[PDB]
Write a protein that binds this ligand. Structure first.
Ligand SMILES: O=c1ccn([C@@H]2O[C@H](COP(=O)(O)OP(=O)(O)OP(=O)(O)O)[C@@H](O)[C@H]2O)c(=O)[nH]1
Ligand SMILES: O=c1ccn([C@@H]2O[C@H](COP(=O)(O)OP(=O)(O)OP(=O)(O)O)[C@@H](O)[C@H]2O)c(=O)[nH]1
Ligand SMILES: O=c1ccn([C@@H]2O[C@H](COP(=O)(O)OP(=O)(O)OP(=O)(O)O)[C@@H](O)[C@H]2O)c(=O)[nH]1
Ligand SMILES: c1ccc(-c2csc(Nc3nc4cc5c(cc4s3)OCO5)n2)nc1
Ligand SMILES: c1ccc(-c2csc(Nc3nc4cc5c(cc4s3)OCO5)n2)nc1
Ligand SMILES: c1ccc(-c2csc(Nc3nc4cc5c(cc4s3)OCO5)n2)nc1
Ligand SMILES: NC(=O)CC[C@H](N)C(=O)O
Ligand SMILES: NC(=O)CC[C@H](N)C(=O)O
Ligand SMILES: NC(=O)CC[C@H](N)C(=O)O
Ligand SMILES: [Mg+2]
Ligand SMILES: [Mg+2]
Ligand SMILES: [Mg+2]
Lengths: 535, 535, 535
């Protein structure tokens, strides 16, 4: 019979941004390849009940699940490395826990007690952790749950989750629980030395709350010397087999290979006494060939907020690269500002050297006229264009203005527009998976190679059915809809008007994986390659 | 012009139950007698949004304000020592703060930030503290706000409030902020020595969070020797003028005299540079004469949960003593269990030696038949009876059963009763002050010496107007009502049926003060004295 | 009259090696240039009573004072920036403090008390701090004492000194005491962001022991953005005028200019209310011209332990550069291993491209045959050579072997040598300043331009007076001696044998300053320049 389910806790020291979520994802990929069944959880110590209120240009994109949960973006790294649809239960926040305990208290469920952080908050967190280990709807019980604890050890907001993880160690014992601690080793250029003292103080801080790490991951810009690992092992009371050197890798897809070279997964498997097996690399070896040995390069403009990389489009950038991997092409992202495209000369300057334009969606944007300028320029030049949610809305507005409805706009951006071609059907936010039907041999039907699809949604405005007949005077096809046809889901131009100009109301980048590119990103990068070839 | 408003923070170490709320009340009484205007606040670190859910026999009574807030009972010590109606704003809890910040977050008011314990929770607490210093509805600004921080220094739940108090010290400076720290000095009988080490570790804990105490209150069963106070002052870095010895006093009304003997208030006034004046003792000297030199003793049965003192009836016990002070009588409380009175022989055993029976109210009780037995016995013996809220309901039920409605009951305790003489007008809980009119020369009108009164409410059942005519066949008078007569507020028997048997739907014990006894408790203890005299 | 003496405490966070000793030296240079009288102290938390036992290749050179104290090398940065002879009292260690308190205890001086860390150790440290503020032998009282506390805030060994510094703040008050805190801001290359969290946790650690910093020095590889300094100031409760950005400078002599650009000294002068004045830069501007705009470059071989920079020769490297500054020459140090010079072909490989050879001294070396090979090669090539202490001993041994005493050696390295030309006069270690007389118009007399000098000593072997007549058959002159002639202090070859081959038994690099080059290093770098010119 199957063993007891193991719990592995991932924690971080010195600083955030050390990549412990990619560490947890790579350890999940490794343990999955050894034949274990892994499930994953993130704990977020912030008080927002979900990141749907948070600014994505400051705090990164909101990930959306099939069940329509708005989650932290680390759940997207879990999805991309596991290739699994994760539930909304995969993300916990302090705001959810406190709101739940206070609601139970106001209903009288604690039978007249004083309600406290310990036990009642830590009990709610511990319940949410132990719930992950229960059998799924198909009867499968995980072999391990990997739980990543957000923040830094030493943060006031981190303390309840670390106390609950300690209580899980006490309840299940050291045979069923493993603690992995991520820490920074800085280099000082004037004296030319790596400093171990920050890791020592971080492990001392962790020990002061009753947790001893089973392994240390040392984050550094260069390989940590053996003598320094020995000093760390000695001072931190950690097995030298558990002090792992992890210099920064060229891509996130190398991290599994790095962790396997150091034998972290073998250390974990031995320590937890799990059913050992060798890793099979064949598919991740094919991935890394497509990563590191591309046959060609193509440039995609991303018409976003600013001319620099932002986690606001992390999953769009990853989906573009994955769509390139299918062709063995390097997709270089040219981050273009929306506002430089507002003038037609400015558009021709910024969007001039690129081979495709992507118009990304999301909340946290105000004003869209520059994106409509980018679309108009791209259609004039004959570039391929992929518009995601708001990109569809901009394509429909640009079409409406092209048919002479010069003041036509989204009611979200001109409530006084005489022709609200985009309007609420504040309306209702559509969230999560909805089905669609595609017109046969429509461009999107060729991309999916089917007439029936489902995609994840996060929007509250719809294409105005009152304007369809006028918009269609451009030749635009409402080629994909809700199954009743009531809602437009996809728009396309026929192939003889433009080679590929497509918008979708959905967020398909959330369904993409490096091992399984999404069909539209494949077809879009294909049209970009064909443009570069024809130009 | 008036100075800046000072903030004095009261905090506790080693343990709870050290009496820091009575300390804060006595310091408020002293500073008021020197002519300063004092206002008071309590911070409760528990997550209950109010104690209305908490069991009063475990956690003490719920105090009720004029504006109908359910508050912690320490607000009642503030009311009794200040003789001031305090607002609901006088009590803050962690549950209120978190519920408020989470509601603001879900409304988008933090403009896309990550919401954190620091700043946003500590900012909400600091706002609630600094709000106390604003002018009242009559334009009066307090000279000092005294803020008592609940829990013990070292509790996880205490940390946000202590951090906010530190931020107030940083914002206003040491000239406007004073920290008072209450601590325990234990005596060890085998070695015969007082131990200073617990206070040293408590002050070290306080210093580790950035607060240095301005004075230490040492709680002990015996007077602390001068050499020990010197050792404490030396080790704790506290001015020897600020190490105060406070042995346990015979009554809570002695604590002001004790604190003045040690010159704590003079130390505070000097340190804060407040307008000095002498205390006038004349009224508190008259109080302490009525406390310590009573002319006679009378026994009042309290028919409560159990035969021992409980904070579930703290304000009823204090109101009974205050009602005795008017007569210069010692009122000795005979705590009687409800259940020993269920049999008539058991009632005659427990309620046999007493001169009056009080039937107290509250939530947290189930079953009332023993209290109805107590009332029936007391009316048979001819004892005086005062029934508070539920005591009125029991008196009305006992009357209904006496007129032959043998199964008549409260629907709260027999939902299947054929004659629900007490019923909901789950109904609506009446809270706070409501007016009443009293029948002229009714017994209650003689007690108040008026026909118009207002009293605080906390109940959701009413006397059934359908049964008034039948209940009145006992001779019961509905002598006090709501101003329309729709609701019964007071019941009495005429004086020739019984000397004093009164119930009120209100909680008059909340309006009582030691310096200002409530009229009904005066009239009840008077009827008890008259019974002892006649018997 | 002069004000009270101010105490400024320098402390470090996150890691050691952040350069807080050069920070303290540069602040001393700045405050001296504004006309204040500064004196300096270092506290070392290690238990060694002095570093004379510690390995200099692991822990850096031992500095030697005029009074013959063996001290930490930071006292040499104090000497070079102040140009002051510092006492042995300038360095305190835990070993000295504990040895002193335990000796007092064993003598009964604590009158039968229990001896404790607090008070007695912290009292001894506080006494050693406050002693620095007493008038010197000429009656001058310092305006400020700058005290650098070694280690990192969070180290167990640091805690007594930080507690004593807190007690000094409490005793003298915030008007007389300033706390400067040095901290690291790391850069993470994968995400491209500077992290403030390590500084926040470091300041929180400092606050947890009762110290609030008056200013933060942020150590970084790049200039910290204004928004990050604002975040730090906000979270750490530090005045934004006191958050100082200090990227790594090209040389240690730029740090004063960097700290003045940020106005740290003006912030300090204002905060301490010291007599303000402008800095005069004229001499440090001339220094920085000689640093940054040299007219030529010359290569000096250093025949040390290893082919890389070591703090074992920090003051020798600085003395060589200072000796170059006089000529406006860049002296590039070619670090050469002793052992590569053991074969004559290996010597001709390693010492081939250089223009002068320096043979440095010290303890912590075993075996000298490679240095004798280097000297023999250099004399054959005709290179100039400067031998410091052991370098003199090697020159005398090389001479003895050149006159045919093939087995002649130091008894320290061959106790069985038949001809111990270097021997103990374990002998007595000579420490500190001793006088010497120089033969008139000897090469050393031309260098000093005098016949009478004093130099610092740290050695226990002497030139064997029994061998002088034989060694002189080489033509070597014992041109400098003790005043009686009993001890050889300097050896030279006459100018027609070699242009400059000099050894001294002393450590003249300890008397050198960048503003005042030592005469021998001037004459040696001059002979190296002349060789490069003639070759
Ligand atoms: O992965 C996570 C998840 C959540 N959080 C939570 O976000 C909040 C901010 O935590 P930060 O680490 O971001 O602190 P900071 O921004 O102010 O400092 P630096 O960037 O300069 O380094 C904290 O409450 C933390 O618990 C994380 O830090 N990391
Ligand atoms: O059994 C022992 C042995 C040794 N010591 C050592 O004696 C020193 C004094 O430790 P104390 O416990 O006696 O502190 P204190 O006297 O100042 O406080 P109180 O009596 O009022 O409670 C401390 O350094 C301690 O470590 C003990 O306390 N107990
Ligand atoms: O300037 C000083 C003086 C003295 N010390 C004392 O030396 C001892 C070692 O303190 P370290 O800072 O050197 O710790 P570490 O070597 O083991 O860690 P890393 O180098 O890798 O960063 C500690 O006891 C400290 O108090 C310093 O660290 N710095
Ligand atoms: C956002 C931010 C960064 C990146 C990005 C691109 S490449 C790269 N390199 C990395 N190497 C390691 C190596 C680790 C580790 C984490 C990382 S991250 O934890 C275990 O050892 N990070 N992408 C988007
Ligand atoms: C509930 C619980 C107790 C009592 C009760 C009855 S008598 C008594 N004696 C006391 N003396 C002091 C002296 C203090 C002090 C607090 C107290 S409490 O803080 C400052 O110094 N406590 N009543 C109801
Ligand atoms: C041994 C080790 C290093 C060096 C060396 C050579 S150059 C250089 N650059 C530096 N810049 C700053 C800037 C600071 C500071 C310290 C330093 S050290 O604290 C205040 O701001 N360090 N030499 C011998
Ligand atoms: N996710 C998005 O791109 C949203 C686009 C637009 N604000 C809408 O709600 O329809
Ligand atoms: N406060 C009370 O005594 C409440 C009594 C009764 N449970 C009611 O609600 O009417
Ligand atoms: N300081 C030194 O170079 C010492 C050299 C040699 N060991 C001696 O004592 O004489
Ligand atoms: Mg070290
Ligand atoms: Mg003792
Ligand atoms: Mg941040």
């Amino acid at each position: 019979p199957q063993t007891a389910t193991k719990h592995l806790f991932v924690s971080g020291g010195v600083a955030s941004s050390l990549g412990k979520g990619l560490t947890a994802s790579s350890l999940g990929q490794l343990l999955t390849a050894r034949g274990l069944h892994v499930t994953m959880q993130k704990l977020d110590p912030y008080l927002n009940v979900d990141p749907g209120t948070m600014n994505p240009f400051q705090h990164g994109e909101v990930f959306v699940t099939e069940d329509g949960a708005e989650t932290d973006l680390d759940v997207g790294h879990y999805e991309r490395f596991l290739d699994r649809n994760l539930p909304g239960s995969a993300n916990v926040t302090t705001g959810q826990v406190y709101s739940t305990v206070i609601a139970k208290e106001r209903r009288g469920e604690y039978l007249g007690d004083t309600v406290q952080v310990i036990p009642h908050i830590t009990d709610e967190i511990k319940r949410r952790i132990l719930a992950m280990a229960q059998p799924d709807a198909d009867g499968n019980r995980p072999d391990v749950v990997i739980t990543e604890i957000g923040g830094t050890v030493g943060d006031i907001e981190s303390q309840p989750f670390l106390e609950a993880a300690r209580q899980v160690r006490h309840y299940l014992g050291r045979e069923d629980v493993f603690f992995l601690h991520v820490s920074l080793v800085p280099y000082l250029a004037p004296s030319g030395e790596l400093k171990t003292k920050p890791t020592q103080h971080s492990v001392a801080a962790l020990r002061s709350i009753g947790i001893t790490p089973d392994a240390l991951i040392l984050r550094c810009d260069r390989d940590v010397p053996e003598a320094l690992k020995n000093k760390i092992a000695l001072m931190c009371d950690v097995d030298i087999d558990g002090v792992i050197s992890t210099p920064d890798a060229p891509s996130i897809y190398d991290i599994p290979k790095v962790l396997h070279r150091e034998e972290l997964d073998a250390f974990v498997v031995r320590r937890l006494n799990l059913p050992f097996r060798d890793v099979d690399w064949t598919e991740w070896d094919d991935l890394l060939r497509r990563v590191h040995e591309p046959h060609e390069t193509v440039r995609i403009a991303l018409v976003g907020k600013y001319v620099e990389l932002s986690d606001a489009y992390l999953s769009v950038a990853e989906a573009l690269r994955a769509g390139g991997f299918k062709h063995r092409a390097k997709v270089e992202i040219c981050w273009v500002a929306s506002d430089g495209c507002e003038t037609t000369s400015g558009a021709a300057a910024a969007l001039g050297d690129v081979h495709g334009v992507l118009i990304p969606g999301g909340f946290g944007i105000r004003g869209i006229e520059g994106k409509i300028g980018a679309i108009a320029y791209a259609r004039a030049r004959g570039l391929p264009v992929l518009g995601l949610c708001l990109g569809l809305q901009c394509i429909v507005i640009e079409a409406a203005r092209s048919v002479g409805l010069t003041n036509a706009n989204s009611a979200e951006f001109d409530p006084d527009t005489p022709d609200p071609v985009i309007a609420t059907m504040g309306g209702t936010m559509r969230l999560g998976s909805y089905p669609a039907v595609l017109e046969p041999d429509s461009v999107v039907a060729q991309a999916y190679q089917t007439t029936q699809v489902s995609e994840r949604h996060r929007h509250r405005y719809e294409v105005n059915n009152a304007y369809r007949d006028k918009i269609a005077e451009s030749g635009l096809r409402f080629s994909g809809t809700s199954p009743d046809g009531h809602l437009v889901e996809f728009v396309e131009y026929p192939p003889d008007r433009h080679p590929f100009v497509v918008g979708t109301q959905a967020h398909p980048e959330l369904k993409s994986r490096p091992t399984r590119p999404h069909p539209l990103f494949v077809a879009f990068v294909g049209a970009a390659i064909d443009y570069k070839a024809g130009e």
